[PDB]
């Protein structure tokens, strides 16, 4: 039985990075060789596991986190990184065991006049823990004066939209990212390679 990796990579809509979606992959057989030996991915880096050995390794569960970030922000999707996305939107643990896949999606996620459907979190009181999702839209209180949920002086909306225009430079173009995390849980392996 094949794994529904097409539902993740070939999905019509991708989530914003602040509200990144996670798909549980289980009870199927995954062939990771085709993904690494593909020619549609601009970024394919793995940590703690060799890309070739994935096809002869078993894991309890596999999680596919997908989102869209800027081009120059893809470097932040890695262990031991800091930045707007890594500190406030999506943080990988320092012991990350998995692969980070990204590809340019300017032809899908960029609209004429600007696609303002993708968002990112501007700031957070504390940095995100690894694999922590923050979908709160409460108004950040920078000052002592309370905000009472109204934008104004010292009261700012925490989310900002990407100005994804087709004329932007490559570093500012939308990039779809898929983070495959491999879980070494003490349970029977529900996903393996063609070993």
């Amino acid at each position: 039985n094949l794994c529904p990796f097409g539902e993740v990579f070939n999905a019509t809509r991708f989530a914003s990075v602040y509200a990144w979606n996670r798909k549980r992959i289980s009870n199927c057989v995954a062939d990771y060789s085709v993904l690494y030996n593909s020619a549609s991915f601009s970024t394919f880096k793995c940590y703690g596991v060799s890309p070739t050995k994935l096809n002869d390794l078993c894991f309890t569960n596999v999680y596919a986190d997908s989102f869209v970030i800027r081009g120059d922000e893809v470097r932040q999707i890695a262990p031991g990184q800091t930045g707007k996305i890594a500190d406030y939107n999506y943080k990988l643990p320092d012991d990350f065991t998995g692969c980070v896949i990204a590809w340019n999606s300017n032809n899908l996620d960029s609209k004429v006049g600007g696609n303002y459907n993708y968002l990112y979190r501007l700031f957070r009181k504390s940095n995100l823990k690894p694999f922590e999702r923050d979908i709160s839209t409460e108004i950040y209180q920078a000052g002592s004066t309370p905000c009472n949920g109204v934008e104004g002086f010292n009261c700012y909306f925490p989310l900002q939209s990407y100005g994804f225009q087709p004329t932007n430079g490559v570093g500012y173009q939308p990039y779809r990212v898929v983070v495959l995390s491999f879980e070494l849980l003490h349970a029977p392996a529900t996903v393996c390679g063609p070993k």
Epitope: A142, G143, S144, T145
Partner: antibody
Framework: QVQLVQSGAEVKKPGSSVKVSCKAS????????FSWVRQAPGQGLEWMGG????????NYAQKFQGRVTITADESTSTAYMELSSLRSEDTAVYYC?????????????????WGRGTLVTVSS | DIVMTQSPDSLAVSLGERATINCKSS????????????LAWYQQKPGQPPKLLIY???TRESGVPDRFSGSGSGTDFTLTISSLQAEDVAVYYC?????????FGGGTKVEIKR
């Protein structure tokens, strides 16, 4: 230590527009609150507006709303103030001020660091 | 808006004597939750930008000498210089940062009494 460097003095014909810069040389920039305080010759201090650059949204005084535009460039640590539809009374020194605290802490808008000032003279 | 009124416009004090400056706010700047007053005092010598002296109406900024003191709560505030020095001749402003718009006082000119 850290100092705020502002653009040079300018002369503008009445009815025109002026844009004044304020570059922060030293330290973090996005997490602070940068305000623009005006002082007409011989008069007191007048708050025009400010911005916390990381949030991009500026807060102005209602008096100048529609005439003043305060922005910031997070990549160059520079805060801008553009005052359009200039009048004779707008002739003053424009100061740039930074809050004492950064964004992770509580940013209350009292200012410990100031720029030496930018003189804008509006006359025929 | 919270109007800030200072009194007097100017005062003359001899060297080594006490100088007191008043600041009146049209609305109370004492937040009930923090029990602290959102008022700051500045000093502006001629030709220079303002210099922060006091914040929270009683707390001195680092580097400000001990001769400067701030007292008051609510709407009535006072800046006091215990012994006036030659390098203290300036204009002193009070500012509120409780709500926008941020408003300054009219300023108070301190001059040497001769």
């Amino acid at each position: 230590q850290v100092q705020l460097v502002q653009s040079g003095a300018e002369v503008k014909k009445p009815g025109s527009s002026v844009k004044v810069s304020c570059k922060a040389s030293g330290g973090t920039f996005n997490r602070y609150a940068f305000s623009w305080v005006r002082q007409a010759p011989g008069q007191g201090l007048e708050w025009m507006g400010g911005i916390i650059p990381i949030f991009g949204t500026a807060n102005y005084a209602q008096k100048f709303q529609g005439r003043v535009t305060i922005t910031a460039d997070e990549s160059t640590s520079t805060a801008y103030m553009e005052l359009s539809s200039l009048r004779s009374e707008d002739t003053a020194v424009y100061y740039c001020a930074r809050s004492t605290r950064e964004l992770p802490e509580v940013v209350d808008w009292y200012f410990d660091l100031w720029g030496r000032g930018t003189l804008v003279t509006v006359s025929s | 808006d919270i109007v800030m009124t200072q009194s007097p416009d100017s005062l003359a004090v001899s060297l080594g004597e006490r100088a007191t400056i008043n600041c009146k706010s049209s609305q109370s700047v004492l937040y009930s939750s923090n029990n602290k007053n959102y008022l700051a005092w500045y000093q502006q010598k001629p030709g220079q930008p303002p210099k922060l002296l006091i914040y929270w109406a009683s707390t001195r900024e680092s580097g400000v000498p001990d001769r400067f003191s701030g007292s008051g709560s609510g709407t009535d505030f006072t800046l006091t210089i215990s012994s006036l020095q030659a390098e203290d001749v300036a204009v002193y402003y009070c500012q509120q940062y409780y709500s926008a718009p941020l408003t300054f006082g009219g300023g108070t000119k301190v001059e040497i009494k001769r």
